[PDB]
Write a protein that binds this ligand. Structure first.
Ligand SMILES: [Mg+2]
Ligand SMILES: [Mg+2]
Ligand SMILES: [Mg+2]
Ligand SMILES: [Mg+2]
Ligand SMILES: [Mg+2]
Ligand SMILES: [Mg+2]
Ligand SMILES: [Mg+2]
Ligand SMILES: [Mg+2]
Ligand SMILES: [Mg+2]
Ligand SMILES: [Mg+2]
Ligand SMILES: [Mg+2]
Ligand SMILES: [Mg+2]
Ligand SMILES: [Mg+2]
Lengths: 85, 122, 86
RNA sequence: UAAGGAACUCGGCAAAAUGACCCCGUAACUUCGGGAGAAGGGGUGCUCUGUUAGGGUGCAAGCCCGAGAGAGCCGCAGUGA
RNA sequence: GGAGAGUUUGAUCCUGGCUCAGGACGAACGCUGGCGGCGUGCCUAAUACAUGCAAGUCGAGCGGACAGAUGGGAGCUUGCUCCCUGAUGUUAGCGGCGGACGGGUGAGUAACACGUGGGUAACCUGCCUGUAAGACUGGGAUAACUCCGGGAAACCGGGGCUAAUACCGGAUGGUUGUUUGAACCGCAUGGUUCAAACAUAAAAGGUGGCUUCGGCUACCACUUACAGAUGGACCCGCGGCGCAUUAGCUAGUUGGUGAGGUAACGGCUCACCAAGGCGACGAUGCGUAGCCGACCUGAGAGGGUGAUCGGCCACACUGGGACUGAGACACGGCCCAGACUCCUACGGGAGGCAGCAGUAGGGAAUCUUCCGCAAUGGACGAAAGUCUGACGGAGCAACGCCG
RNA sequence: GGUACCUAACCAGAAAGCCACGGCUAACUACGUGCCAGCAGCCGCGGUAAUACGUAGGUGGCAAGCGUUGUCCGGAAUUAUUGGGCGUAAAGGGCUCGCAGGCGGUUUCUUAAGUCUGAUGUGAAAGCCCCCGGCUCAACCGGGGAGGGUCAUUGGAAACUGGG
RNA sequence: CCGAAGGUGGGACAGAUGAUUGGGGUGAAGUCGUAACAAGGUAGCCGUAUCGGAAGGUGCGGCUGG
RNA sequence: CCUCCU
């Protein structure tokens, strides 16, 4: 099927305790509008992990979905990296 | 049966909410006033922004009482409360609206503007 | 109102609702019959109730009350309960 | 004890009112302890679910303590004195 | 594509503010005033409003009054009368569509409201125009009109009726649901296509003409599928205000599971579980604010503004709720409450100028109680046409820009 | 609306203005006041010879108006990213220890978030503007472009910043 | 059941106003002294304490901008 | 010790 993809993101798993759910933090370097320095921005996200596989440190990719709760808007597509301790 | 110190609800939109009876008018040692009698009174509670202000001495006509009133046919009327309407010397109400039912007795005393403005006259 | 067709639309819509409520009530009552039958363990009656339900459901769709998706949702819910009995 | 409600009186004197338990909630100010039961509110009988959950005792049977719920029932009024 | 000047001293250089020359405006006020052509004109009280007018239409749905008279009849003062229902006309009342647009105002809103972002696999989508099936067979009621009772009344309840393109019954219907499998797959939840069974679900005829009076038509038009299109709904990244002399906030709060609801995804609602979520990258609170196209200014960076004109949003005397539907949880509707206006013989009714004009009030200050749908665009209708303070014009005012 | 526009007389008749004139910024003398009366954007004028006040006569801009007050941007490299400072002009914290943060020697390999780059989609119409045309030029309307994104999506490059 | 308005209650916040009171600013020619500027006639100034109509004085420590 | 205002 020739489907246009939704906006996909990747980041570190900062939260996990919420079962069936995670917080993925897409850190990035937005330029400041006036002064032009790369400032360390960080957008948190809320994705879904049905199996409860992800943990602290996992640099997972997530893709947009139907609203899976009030805050949740994404799914755990794949655990790319698997950090431990 | 309203006497000195009786507090009344004000049944109008003049600004006064509660009045204290200073004097029953109409004779020297007159103890008690009933429906259709005029009283001098002070405003104890007022609505903020109203025409009539707290502390003003004013005339009011009693329009409902708990004691109520007897009619020549041997029937009576009573209300759950004592209430009056602030008036000018010509009997016209200082407010523009009357709240709650008033007694037929006000027609007899020629408080016509009040009787016309009242939602019910029993 | 203070318009001719407004006064008609006032008088019309009242008379429509009454008629309309009938059919919803009829539907909802017919839905309760199926729901009641699940408790008693009687599928044979639930099928014959589900037909009368489904009739009353679809009459509301025709008039312009129950949306097709709304009806779709109801007949789903009921049929799962009937099959869940057996 | 009608209506009124401190008009009484030197003075609310006397009387009335408040009053139990559980729950919510509680200001100024403060020596940071307090203030505080501040204030202001809500619940409270009986029946069934029900020898409830749970707890004590006991090998058990049993006995004892016992929330909080839901559904009802009655009265003007359930800490009905 | 970028200009400076005056002013601290007795005089000096510097630092440093202040002031001026420029442009802009919905301006106001003085004084003065000729005409013309385009444009602009409540920024204050989202204050209250007298009066009028601003959405009504379809008789080719409609029984019915009330007319029509082509003709016959018509007693007979030819003067007037008439008795039948002419083609068909006027269309209170019923039924349909529209009234959710167009118009107005920016009160609220610091929010996915907006400006630039997806599912379209989470949705909806009447009207319009296509391609694809049909209007077959049951009746039963109800306005008006009438009868009766009300209402001084305003308005209205019974009784017998009558119609409809109003409504309901049943068959067979691809839709829809369920199940039985397949086929094929995506971005996980899946999606798309096909076949049978079970279950459910359709319509409406009014005109003009021809009927071999069996019927067959055609514009309009009723109903069903796959489309396209159109207009809505949700979601998301990222953007764009002030105050820390606002540092903690939250308890349906954060996620789960289940149930319900919704066109639709979802604490959206609830039950039962846990204990989360947010925040120094400024949460929370307070203040202010419709956002955007743009506009003014400037070499530009920036700064300010968001009247007029276009788009998105929100609101409609204040506040709450649903009904009808493809679509308002309604701008000239209703239901309920509140404060105000009106009527009421007192029981009860009616309305909302942030529609055009206008009035009062506020204010430094902002128009005509105007003419016309001829034009453009709507709504209705097959059309003629009707309605249209939308709109076109004109009145007013040196308020601009320019002839 | 018998309104625009034409003809044709009465005929250039009906159609000139306001403000400013120390300096900034091109533009002066009588008289009457006498620190009074008054003036004033700033500097400042007037106490008995006022080129800035009251009056009277006299002149550069733009063109039925222009003065006055109000608001905004400029001038103001005067909140300074572009583009400023802190010995004495305003300005170094009294001095440490340090959490977060900011910043970080050299080589090499690898990565590719940042950085750069190609291609594709949208950023309505009006307005302002590039060529700009038409309406007699205008105080105005059309088309094709451009800008418009710290924006997607994808393919490269890999020095530099970041990660191993 | 939910539920607008209403009622009751105790808090929070903002504005207006208030007897009186506090300094502040400004104001051609008021009164008192003379603190500072010169070694300003006791070098001045900084912190702090205390005292005094008032500038100020005095102590302690500091600075040179003596 | 003080030295009116412009
Ligand atoms: Mg007593
Ligand atoms: Mg008593
Ligand atoms: Mg006494
Ligand atoms: Mg006494
Ligand atoms: Mg006592
Ligand atoms: Mg606002
Ligand atoms: Mg600047
Ligand atoms: Mg110095
Ligand atoms: Mg210094
Ligand atoms: Mg230092
Ligand atoms: Mg000295
Ligand atoms: Mg000395
Ligand atoms: Mg001493």
């Amino acid at each position: 099927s020739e489907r246009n993809q939704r906006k996909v993101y990747q980041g570190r798993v900062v939260s996990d305790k919420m079962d069936k759910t995670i917080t993925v933090v897409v850190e990035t370097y937005k330029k400041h509008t006036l002064y032009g320095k790369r400032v360390k921005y960080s957008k948190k996200f809320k994705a879904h992990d049905e199996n409860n596989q992800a943990k602290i440190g996992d640099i997972v990719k997530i893709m947009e979905t139907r609203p899976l709760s009030a805050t949740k808007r994404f799914r755990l597509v794949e655990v790319v990296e698997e950090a431990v301790i | 049966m309203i006497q000195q110190e009786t507090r009344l609800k004000v049944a109008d939109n003049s600004g006064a909410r509660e009045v204290l009876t200073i004097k029953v008018l109409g004779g020297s040692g007159r103890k008690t006033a009933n429906i259709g009698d005029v009283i001098v009174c002070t405003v104890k509670q007022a609505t903020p922004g109203g025409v009539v202000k707290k502390g003003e001495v004013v005339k009011a006509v009693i329009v409902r009482t708990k004691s109520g009133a007897r009619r020549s046919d041997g029937s009576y009327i009573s209300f759950d409360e004592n209430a009056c309407v602030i008036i000018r010397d010509d009997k016209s109400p200082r407010g523009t609206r009357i709240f709650g039912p008033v007694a037929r007795e006000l027609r007899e005393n020629n408080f016509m503007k009040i009787v016309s403005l009242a939602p019910e006259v029993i | 109102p203070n318009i001719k067709s407004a006064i008609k639309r006032t008088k019309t819509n009242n008379e429509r609702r009454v008629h309309n409520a009938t059919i919803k009530s009829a539907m909802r009552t017919a839905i309760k019959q199926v729901e009641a039958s699940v408790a008693n363990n009687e599928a044979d009656k639930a099928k014959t109730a589900l037909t009368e339900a489904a009739k009353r459901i679809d009459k509301a769709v025709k008039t312009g009350l129950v949306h097709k998706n709304t009806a779709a949702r109801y007949k789903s819910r009921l049929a799962k309960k009937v099959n869940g009995l057996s």
